[PDB]
């Protein structure tokens, strides 16, 4: 029975504990004996599961901390709209969104950095942003900078609500544990009230703000004749010259929905499914129909689970009935117990939830990246080549960090919240009980793909060096065609069953070329041998990332080395130099190594993207129809030797960031060197250990004891785990800033 039960003023509101940091840990809250206490105060600030013990008080910290997080995002969202309001050329870019470059965030004249305020077209000097905010505000219906400014104001006051709601729900009315543990009611409101009503609300905006505004902006009315979005509703006659097949009145225009005469809506809720050829983005009428289909289908989804009115589903014994008197015969191997005791896993522990919710938010972010290039939803998005690359690349990296974090808390769940009694012989226990057959076969497929993806690049690298291009894995030598992916590219373009979609979704699949401002918005992306080989690099690097991360989850509890690895904790350096050496046996140390493999995998994904667009998709169209790509078919022939990657992609395409001094791209030249420093700097922490460094402090503490200037916060070299965390935080920081600088210097030097 779902009920709202809360406490009344559980935690007082005072600065008593601000003046005594480290209060959350009893070991931290007794004095700063060494500098290790300083670092422990930050590595433990958010591990609420070690501050207290009861799930009621832990969950109140989680729920209140989310509010302060939503406040931070609203501060950041406000900053985006405020900069788009009074520090941008957004007004100029609305008039001519081809020759004007998008730019907010101008630069102050000090230190000679005014050179970064490059020319943007229209006499505006700033930095060419690649975040795609402008392409999104045009699709939202923004026309002037007052609407942007008042949204920034509307976000700051919205952040203040998030801060108040977090203080209110920790210090005034904190919910009890019964309010948290009804996840079955939370799914109803998140599926229907949040995702269903959210996309119902948005399709309300699309039809009444975005569809009319982008209708007139495609006819060139130049921001005078654009009515303000409310003047489309106060003047309903104004939307009859547009979409005349509807009626557009308060009551008289809405009744086709209720009387089910939905044919009057066919002019603004279309199912065209292609790219709007004047802007290159998706048809907003086709987008508005999508959100209405999504809204209807999510509100329906939110009625699946059973709250206190009897009707609905119960997750508890939908799980408990996945035993094996009742499965398909070929997958009846998962236990007589099956899934029993697994609803208590995903309800009594937040790390179990965080592991799944991160691994799916991470996978969603990578799926989103793949979908926002192959079918750009925003006007003039696809032609801004610097935004297409920087939006795909941002969301692949964001999606890959989240996936590694889903494997972190899958391992923190094991060594902190895993309960053997509720998990006896069930689906989770039967995995730990054969975890050597899972890792043996993962370590074999990781190794099968390693030879059959990378070592074929060393075959090609050697035949082309010998001068035997006819025995290399080329399109001209030994062809490796992606047979099953060229088949799908044929399936997805002949289905235009699904007959109503007369325009092919995703010109990437095939058919037609869209050129908007002369630049190609989207072309078919054909797959040859170079795409067979690069896709098995992706399979290989994803698998080893899975192998590193899954090994840390399965062997988090114990191993054949250390049968009591769970008592040592989640984050321990080692178990001594015995057994030959047990360095990095913790589950944390498999997250630390999986971060490197995430870096390797995703930096190969964004390199596959960046080169394949420049060679096969992007480019410019002349007065005949031929397409001259940015690198000109370079991927097909020279991406098959990893000498070709080094000269035709890394050496060749870094010309824009190398020769960027004394120009407006000067800051990408410094970031590109800055990323190189931080990567090399990381290797100090990765290759060395803290015995050398601690013994070096002793010789430096002596020089301070001599001059009577020693501190009482005794200088200790960083922990073993801390030193490994510093190493991976800098390797990933430095190795990404250098890629971020290289991508954007290359594509803001072109367009």
């Amino acid at each position: 029975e779902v009920r709202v039960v809360v406490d009344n003023d559980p935690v007082p509101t005072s600065f008593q504990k601000w003046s005594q940091p480290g209060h959350f840990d009893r070991t931290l809250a007794k004095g700063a004996k060494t500098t290790t206490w300083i670092w422990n105060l930050h590595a433990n600030a958010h591990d609420f599961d070690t501050h207290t013990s009861d799930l009621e008080d832990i969950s109140r910290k989680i729920f209140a901390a989310h509010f302060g997080h939503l406040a931070v995002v609203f501060i950041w969202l406000s900053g985006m709209y405020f900069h788009g309001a009074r520090f941008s050329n957004f007004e100029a870019w609305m008039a001519n969104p081809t020759g004007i470059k998008p730019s907010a965030q101008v630069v102050w004249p000090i230190f000679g950095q005014e050179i970064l305020n490059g020319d943007m077209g229209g006499g505006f000097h700033g930095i060419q942003i690649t975040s795609g905010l402008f392409q999104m505000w045009r699709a939202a219906g923004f026309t002037n900078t007052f609407q942007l400014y008042c949204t920034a104001i509307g976000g700051l006051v919205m952040a203040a609500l998030m801060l108040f709601a977090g203080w209110f729900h920790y210090h005034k009315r904190a919910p009890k544990l019964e309010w948290f543990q009804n996840t079955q009611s939370m799914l109803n409101h998140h599926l229907a009230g949040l995702l269903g009503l959210g996309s119902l609300g948005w399709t309300g905006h699309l039809i009444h703000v975005s569809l009319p505004t982008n209708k007139l902006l495609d006819t060139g009315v130049a921001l005078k004749d654009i009515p303000l979005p409310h003047e489309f509703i106060l003047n309903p006659s104004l939307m009859n010259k547009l979409y005349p097949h509807a009626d557009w009145g308060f009551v008289k225009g809405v009744v086709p929905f209720f009387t089910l005469q939905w044919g009057h809506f066919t002019d603004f809720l279309t199912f065209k499914g292609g790219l709007n050829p004047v802007t290159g983005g998706l048809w907003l009428t086709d987008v508005a129909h999508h959100h209405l289909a999504i809204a209807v289908m999510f509100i329906i989804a939110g009625h699946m689970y059973r709250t206190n009115w009897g009707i609905g589903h119960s997750i508890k014994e939908m799980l408990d009935d996945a035993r094996t008197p009742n499965m398909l015969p070929f997958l009846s191997f998962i236990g007589p117990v099956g899934h029993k005791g697994l609803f208590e896993v995903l309800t009594t522990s937040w790390h179990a939830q965080l592991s799944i919710n991160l691994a799916m938010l991470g996978s969603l972010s990578i799926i989103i990246a793949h979908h926002m290039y192959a079918m750009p939803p925003y006007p003039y998005l696809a032609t801004d080549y610097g935004t297409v690359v920087s939006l795909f690349t941002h969301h692949v990296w964001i999606g890959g960090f989240l996936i590694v974090g889903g494997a972190a808390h899958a391992a923190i769940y094991m060594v902190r919240d895993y309960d053997p009694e509720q998990n006896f012989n069930n689906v989770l226990d039967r995995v730990l009980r054969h975890r050597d057959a899972i890792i043996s076969h993962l370590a074999w497929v990781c190794q099968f793909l390693g030879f059959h993806s990378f070592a074929m690049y060393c075959h090609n690298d050697t035949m082309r060096a010998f001068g035997r291009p006819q025995d290399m894995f080329s399109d001209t030598g030994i062809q490796l065609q992606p047979v099953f992916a060229q088949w799908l590219q044929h399936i997805h373009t002949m289905t235009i069953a699904a007959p109503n979609l007369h325009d092919p979704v995703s010109y990437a699949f095939g058919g037609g070329v869209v050129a908007v401002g002369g630049k190609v918005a989207m072309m078919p992306i054909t797959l040859g041998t170079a795409d067979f080989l690069i896709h098995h690099i992706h399979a290989f690097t994803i698998h080893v990332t899975v192998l590193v991360l899954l090994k840390g989850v399965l062997f988090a509890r114990s191993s054949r080395l250390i049968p009591d690895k769970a008592n040592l904790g989640f984050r321990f350096p080692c178990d001594g130099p015995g057994r030959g050496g047990t360095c990095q046996v913790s589950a944390w140390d498999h997250v630390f190594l999986g971060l490197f493999w995430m870096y390797n995998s995703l930096s190969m994904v964004i390199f596959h993207f960046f080169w394949k667009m420049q060679s096969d998709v992007w480019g410019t169209v002349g007065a005949d129809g031929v397409v001259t790509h940015i690198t000109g078919g370079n991927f097909a022939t020279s991406s098959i030797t990893n000498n070709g990657w080094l000269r035709d992609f890394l050496w060749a395409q870094s010309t824009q960031v190398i020769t960027s001094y004394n120009t407006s791209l000067s800051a990408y030249g410094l970031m590109f060197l800055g990323g190189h420093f931080i990567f090399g700097f990381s290797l100090m922490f990765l290759f060395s250990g803290r015995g050398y460094w601690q013994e070096l402090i002793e010789s430096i503490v002596w020089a301070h004891n001599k001059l009577k200037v020693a501190p009482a916060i005794q200088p200790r070299a960083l922990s073993i785990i801390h030193g490994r965390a510093v190493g991976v935080a800098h390797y990933l920081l430095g190795g990404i800033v250098t890629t971020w600088a290289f991508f954007l210097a290359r594509m803001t030097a072109f367009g």
Binding site: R560, D564, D575, G576, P577, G578, R579, T582
Partner: protein, 80 residues
């Protein structure tokens, strides 16, 4: 076949024996302590080398040393 030597600086705090995952250490009666105990290592072919006993010894520059020597099939902890 490691070498877990115990020195006269023990205080009989007994903590080294508890940390040992393989029962190499045990207490014998002694007289150089208020505790009247001292660690001994009768089962050192069983020593795995983890030095978990050295982490527990509270005497400054600890009384129990694992001296990693000839490593054999049970001092490396191999189940295969």
């Amino acid at each position: 076949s490691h070498t877990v030597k115990i020195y006269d600086t023990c205080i009989g705090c007994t903590q080294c024996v508890r940390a040992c995952p393989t029962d190499v250490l045990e207490m014998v009666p002694w007289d150089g302590c208020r505790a009247g105990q001292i660690a001994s290592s009768p089962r050192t072919e069983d020593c795995v080398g983890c030095k978990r006993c050295e982490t527990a010894c509270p005497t400054d520059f600890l009384s129990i040393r694992v001296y990693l020597g000839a490593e054999t099939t049970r001092s490396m902890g191999l189940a295969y």
